């Protein structure tokens, strides 16, 4: 559904995923920062698009980035 992307400006503060209410994100090891971790987005099918991840990305503009795309029943957040 939605296309979440994490760019290489991430500092690995784990706010993107601790804010994400649908388990879309997960921190993985990395070698590009002092924290040695970066966020990944495997479960984009569970992405609703609420952008709580990028409302918590403390960078110049953003490192995590949500692109609104094909909306399915779970990205639209329907219990019916």
């Amino acid at each position: 559904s939605h296309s979440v992307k994490i760019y290489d400006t991430c500092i690995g503060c784990t706010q993107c995923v601790r804010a994400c209410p649908t388990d879309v994100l997960e921190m993985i090891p990395w070698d590009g920062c002092k924290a040695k971790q970066i966020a990944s987005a495997p479960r984009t099918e569970d992405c609703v698009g609420c952008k709580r991840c990028e409302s918590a990305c403390p960078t110049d503009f953003l490192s995590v980035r949500v692109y609104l795309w094909h909306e399915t029943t779970r990205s639209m957040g329907l219990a019916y």
Partner: protein, 69 residues
Amino acid sequence: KPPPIGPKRGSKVKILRRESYWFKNVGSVVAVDQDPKTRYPVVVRFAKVNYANISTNNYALDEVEEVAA
């Protein structure tokens, strides 16, 4: 090199990154990650916050340029 690679701690620096809030604005380098594998070591501290109420951001060495002052 083990000696510093980037600007000095306190060197007021300009941002050449086009997507940042402080583009073509000066800053104040508070730290430079001397690890020669990180992509954006230059920790800058600006005076005025961005839209997310943040005054600091990591920048690269090529995305930064020190002023003549």
